[PDB]
Ligand binder design. Structure first.
Ligand SMILES: Cc1cc2nc3c(=O)[nH]c(=O)nc-3n(C[C@H](O)[C@H](O)[C@H](O)COP(=O)(O)OP(=O)(O)OC[C@H]3O[C@@H](n4cnc5c(N)ncnc54)[C@H](O)[C@@H]3O)c2cc1C
Ligand SMILES: Cc1cc2nc3c(=O)[nH]c(=O)nc-3n(C[C@H](O)[C@H](O)[C@H](O)COP(=O)(O)OP(=O)(O)OC[C@H]3O[C@@H](n4cnc5c(N)ncnc54)[C@H](O)[C@@H]3O)c2cc1C
Ligand SMILES: Cc1cc2nc3c(=O)[nH]c(=O)nc-3n(C[C@H](O)[C@H](O)[C@H](O)COP(=O)(O)OP(=O)(O)OC[C@H]3O[C@@H](n4cnc5c(N)ncnc54)[C@H](O)[C@@H]3O)c2cc1C
Ligand SMILES: Cc1cc2nc3c(=O)[nH]c(=O)nc-3n(C[C@H](O)[C@H](O)[C@H](O)COP(=O)(O)OP(=O)(O)OC[C@H]3O[C@@H](n4cnc5c(N)ncnc54)[C@H](O)[C@@H]3O)c2cc1C
Ligand code: PRO
Ligand code: PRO
Ligand code: PRO
Ligand code: PRO
Ligand SMILES: [Cl-]
Ligand SMILES: [Cl-]
Lengths: 383, 383, 383, 383
């Protein structure tokens, strides 16, 4: 039992924080105002190491474990206000780079993986459908086996990075009779006949992180573009959501650390009634709640990632971390706004935008109600 | 003890709801998208009766009590998505029309009040300053008595409607030695030498309701433009915040009623796992929380307004209502978003914008921490 | 819309409060210390009017509506610390007197009802079983029709007043094929062959209110002792739980009013750091939460009872009231204890005993999770 | 960063758990029913190692760090239902053994410390007074320096173990002009002229852990019985409350672990509506809250104790741990009761008694409002 970072871990965090502050955060307000996702900046960040994660040196990575990857992303969330860009990068890493690395064939990794790792190609993961969100293994898209490969049809929605992606990791039923065990995963390229990527659909939360729908009309998928084995798509999707929960969520821990620093500074500076507003217990009690949340959920995340790195069963720990971080990020966003009063309603300060950016953390990679179903199953309450 | 509306009260509600639905709500999405506050629509709403409140027939009003006024505004909040416009109207009514009616001289009412009541003139109330928000009686603006009137200097911030107002109800120290008892209230016109109204300052919450700062540089205020007696400004401001709490807050009750109807409809329609998502207790428990909040806070508001109409001391009841409504409006906005999942991130649906619009309800007319100070004082805990 | 009591309602409340203070509360600490339920005091309270409720003058009652009955019981809960005795009386009234009055035949009312109304006979209601608590219509006790009546077998548990009751209102399956529609209700007397009433089972909550199990071994029930029609037991039980929710819960509103008065007094009297502890916002914020809870849930209860008296559908309103009152009573018990600090751990003060007494309010007459199921059904979420 | 116990730490935990289960828990229900604190059992536990903590081998201890001590006490709280006895032992260890070891002279340790470490002598710590609870450095007891020592007068209240103690560690003003810097600490023996120990004062929480008041009437304290330097009593008391927070609180973590195991077992076993009650999300969501609380607060405690062992500043971490553990212990006690329904009201099961035993965790060693003041000071909000 130990709560210090190794020198190696500290260096990873500090180097990422410096990049996030000095490269990504510079000029972020202009990009955020204009709803710009800078693909040139995105590619620099990817190549710096944010698209690497556990990927081996053979494909351009540094073979980080889950805790190291989480530290890097925590630093990114603390260091850069441009959380839409950070979310876009972490989605590419966790839902696309990592499943290709972990399950792709030698031939598929050789063709595509280093390009994803260095950010030469942007990827999007397409699983959700209009009738399959929480009930994801009810997806209706079909990849019907044929000579040479598969015929793919269906519609995917809410796809992060679809308007900017070069390749798509897509999940579809190769055996529509089944649920989880009837799903396969495939890699398809932008431009393939029958792939119709929709125009970006605007949103107020994560507003510069583009998403859209994609429609498959009789796409031919060559056999070699299946990722992993036939019918293993459910297991692949599952494994990628573990990395998305476990490591992508670190982004919101680092955002909460930055939020707490800003809020503490204001509560010491702002005077009313002849003293700093932090001297009133109504004010200081809320800030203490923010601090208690940050310390608790960061330890939960660190232990979940550490257990993964030890080869222990970390599924319940990662669901617990994702649930706590996202709830705490939203509640603390509200508490920061309440500390600032009327001065919160100020687009240069970013507190309201911060709350908007935290709202979807309770939804993606599985809603918090679904995390509770996962935890309930691990506790033996779904027997 | 009775919980039915009179036929008169029912008619007031239904007529206001019809206007809000058929006149203000029509085309609201376009105006909201473009951040437009339609002054022509605003003036129609004012003249319909939303700028009238308790004002007598002599000045164009219908002599509504507080409960009737609250019913009208509840209907407005349920019937129109354009809550920025509604907030702008209710600010003009509660913080400007009502103090002029209740404290203005015959000569000042004769000159200005009917024009405010019919919406021919838009008004803004200017009390808050950079160093006087919660500690409002620390305001530093000064109205130095001189022959003929006063010389006014100072700066006001966060002023709803300032960029569109024709007249300003302003609070300033006529005796800078004192706090509450050193404040007077004045009416000044747009265009007066020395009045510098700032350009609209954008915000994401209530985004089409314009506000800005105003600066006074050696403005001469003629004696006849003082509202009420010298040194009575604190009492006037206080009384106007009672109407702003007590009746303007009704807007958010009606918004919560509309939100609950939308959320219940979705939870019955949306299927996952072979059933309506409202069949899962995680989902239905949150919707029940929304329903419990709405029923409780609407009764608190109705009783506070009814006690006012009976001539009872309603100050603590109005502070309790404002506190509960605003907290419940924010929490229920979050609960609706969580019910919809990814479909909440949809600008046409308006759920995220609804939450943005509710966030400032915990701040204006006194933050919720200040409401608790008021309640604590009434309970004898500030002795 | 009106929030004043009629003179008649005020008199009912004040007379009950005086009785509770001057008759039941006198000497209560000694009885509570010794875990005594004074049947002589119980009978005086019953005859004063607490066992009357809606019962007509023909049987000794005053034909109170639900709101009047709730006012009487609110006064009882504020006026007497002996909540175990009050709970025992209200259980007899709501679960036994009222179903006999509302559904019993002329012959059964003539024989028993006035004796229950004046407290000459104590009654207990026996529905719950080891395998039928929330799922009450899964009860397995059977009343097999035969010549002359029924043969009753089974076991009931958690029966308030069973060790002191003279008669028992019991629910059993006359058609074991069905659930709700297979239940009938019966009145049986202490002493009947085959009735085995268990010895009192001690508890720390409501510790002087006796309960035990009862076992039926081939009891013969004469036909004339069935209450209402065959198979109508589910509807009778349902209707009695409405009165138990709706009116018995008033007891905990009056207890919260007494608790708040005690807590406010202490927070003004107790000094630390040179001032009253109520001057610290951590302390006053919790007391304000107690006050907000009491005002909200009392209005919900009053409206639920008023709607019942108007002949409106009040089922959802009564479930909402029972849910809020019991949750708020428990949370406010904890908040009072926290206000007192170490002085809460004092058996003469009664704050810890008060919390114990509130804990079962979330369980009896249907748990709060079951109230949410009822509300969810009324909202259309169980379709 | 590591979350495994060393083999040494695991052995400490398992050995303590075995003792708590096989020695202290055996027959605990009878002792709890009779409100017995078994001094023979207490002394066996003390000598086994629960009265040792950081004390060196020279005085009979094993020189445990804070994390090891916390592990031992966590095991005690999980293994034995007799939390009153455990609390009594940990109070003796943290508030009496440890300050004597850390600040006592060679002569005072030589005379008394090994006897306290082996439990031959029971000790009580007496700081709180009628007018000095949270404001502890306002204590009014006086130890007036004289030739040879001090004349002690005053009254202490809420003193754990006073009715059974052989020695008393007492705090009094040697310079009544000052607060914190005017306090000294002394060791006095039962039986000294002028010491009047009150009879046990009963309580429902921790009901077999005896406490009473003590009154000093012109006690002569010999110079050699002062603990540490003159005027250092505030620092000594402060340091002992760190151990009381940081390590004694571990008791309630182990109690929550035992509670969660019992609650999970019941939610899988108890059927209603044809399934285990844990299958309903209302039930499983509450149990998940218990699990999330236990994992978070146990990590906070482990890190606080680990930081102490590393020589880092752990004051804020220990205040955060004490605050979270005690709040979570109370809330989870309520959640367990709600899981069991009517079966919670069963003295053999102990769930209601468990909640009673957790209620004082939010009060002793400084209330949770005072922990928030400590955290606020460490955050720079009390500047
Ligand atoms: C910012 C963002 C980025 C996204 N990126 C991607 C992406 O790149 N690729 C991709 O494939 N998807 C993506 N998603 C989609 C996301 O995975 C889904 O939104 C999510 O799984 C929830 O599905 P849904 O929106 O259909 O909600 P629904 O499943 O309809 O849920 C609606 C409500 O019902 C509740 N509910 C549903 N089932 C249960 C149950 N069994 N028990 C209790 N409550 C239940 C939910 O918790 C929620 O409260 C993204 C979403 C967001 C917000
Ligand atoms: C939408 C909107 C419209 C507005 N319209 C107008 C308008 O038309 N005219 C006008 O004059 N003003 C207007 N206001 C300003 C509003 O009145 C102030 O924002 C408000 O009074 C709070 O002041 P502040 O923003 O300076 O916050 P501060 O006073 O700085 O408060 C900051 C934080 O400190 C807390 N705090 C302060 N003092 C205490 C205390 N004693 N105890 C406990 N906590 C304390 C507050 O609760 C808050 O959490 C508007 C504000 C909003 C949001
Ligand atoms: C003080 C007291 C007095 C009583 N007096 C009487 C009396 O006089 N006569 C009488 O007949 N009974 C009496 N009862 C019994 C009472 O009616 C039952 O305790 C109650 O209905 C709950 O049943 P149970 O205890 O079997 O809990 P269970 O039904 O076992 O409930 C256990 C847990 O499961 C939850 N749960 C169960 N089903 C669902 C579901 N569908 N959805 C979600 N959660 C669910 C419950 O909410 C609870 O959290 C009394 C109880 C109390 C506490
Ligand atoms: C089980 C138990 C065992 C104990 N054992 C011992 C023992 O062995 N020796 C010993 O000396 N003492 C002992 N104590 C006493 C304990 O230290 C005091 O009870 C505690 O410090 C609180 O003091 P008080 O009871 O006077 O509460 P008060 O100080 O009166 O507090 C009352 C309320 O006011 C609040 N409050 C007070 N000041 C502030 C502030 N500045 N800001 C915000 N809120 C404030 C408190 O948080 C609380 O809500 C024990 C207490 C308990 C419950
Ligand atoms: O399926 C999802 O929801 C995840 C979210 C991050 C990228 N894709
Ligand atoms: O002073 C304020 O805060 C109020 C809010 C509505 C208009 N002016
Ligand atoms: O069935 C029950 O739970 C109710 C509680 C009051 C009397 N009987
Ligand atoms: O002073 C107190 O409150 C601590 C509690 C444990 C023993 N003494
Ligand atoms: Cl469910
Ligand atoms: Cl304060």
């Amino acid at each position: 039992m130990d709560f210090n970072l190794s020198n190696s871990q500290s260096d990873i965090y500090e180097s990422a924080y410096r990049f996030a502050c000095d490269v990504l955060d510079q000029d972020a307000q202009t990009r955020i105002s204009q709803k710009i996702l800078s693909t040139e900046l995105w590619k620099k960040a990817a190549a710096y190491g944010f698209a690497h994660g556990p990927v081996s040196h053979q494909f351009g990575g540094s073979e980080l474990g889950a805790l190291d990857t989480a530290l890097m992303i925590e630093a990114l969330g603390k260091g850069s206000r441009d959380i839409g860009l950070s979310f876009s990068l972490c989605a590419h890493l966790c839902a696309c780079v990592i499943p290709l690395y972990r399950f792709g064939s030698s031939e598929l990794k050789d063709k595509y993986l280093e390009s994803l790792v260095t950010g030469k190609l942007i990827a999007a993961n397409a699983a959700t459908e209009p009738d399959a969100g929480s009930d994801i293994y009810n997806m209706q898209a079909t990849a019907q086996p044929c000579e040479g490969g598969y015929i793919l049809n269906g519609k995917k929605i809410f796809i992060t990075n679809a308007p900017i992606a070069d390749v798509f990791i897509i999940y579809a039923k190769t055996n529509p009779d089944h649920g989880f065990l009837g799903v396969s995963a495939f890699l398809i390229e932008k431009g393939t006949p029958g792939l119709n990527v929709g125009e970006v659909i605007p949103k107020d939360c994560l507003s510069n992180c583009p998403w859209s729908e994609i429609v498959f009309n009789d796409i031919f998928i060559p056999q070699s573009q299946r990722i992993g084995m036939e019918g293993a798509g459910g297991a692949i999707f599952h494994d990628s959501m573990i990395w998305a929960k476990g490591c992508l969520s670190a982004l919101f821990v680092g955002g909460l650390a930055r939020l707490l620093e800003t809020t503490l500074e204001y509560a010491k500076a702002r005077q009313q009634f002849g003293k700093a507003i932090g001297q009133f217990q109504s004010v200081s009690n809320r800030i203490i709640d923010m601090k208690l949340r940050l310390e608790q959920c960061r330890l939960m995340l660190y232990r979940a990632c550490w257990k993964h790195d030890q080869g222990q069963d970390a599924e319940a720990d990662i669901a617990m971390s994702k649930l706590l971080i996202s709830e705490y990020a939203v509640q603390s966003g509200l508490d920061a706004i309440q500390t600032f009063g009327g001065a919160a309603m100020d687009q240069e300060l970013g507190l309201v935008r911060h709350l908007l950016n935290m709202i979807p953390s309770r939804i993606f990679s599985g809603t918090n109600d679904i995390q509770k179903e996962i935890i309930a199953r691990k506790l033996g309450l779904r027997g």
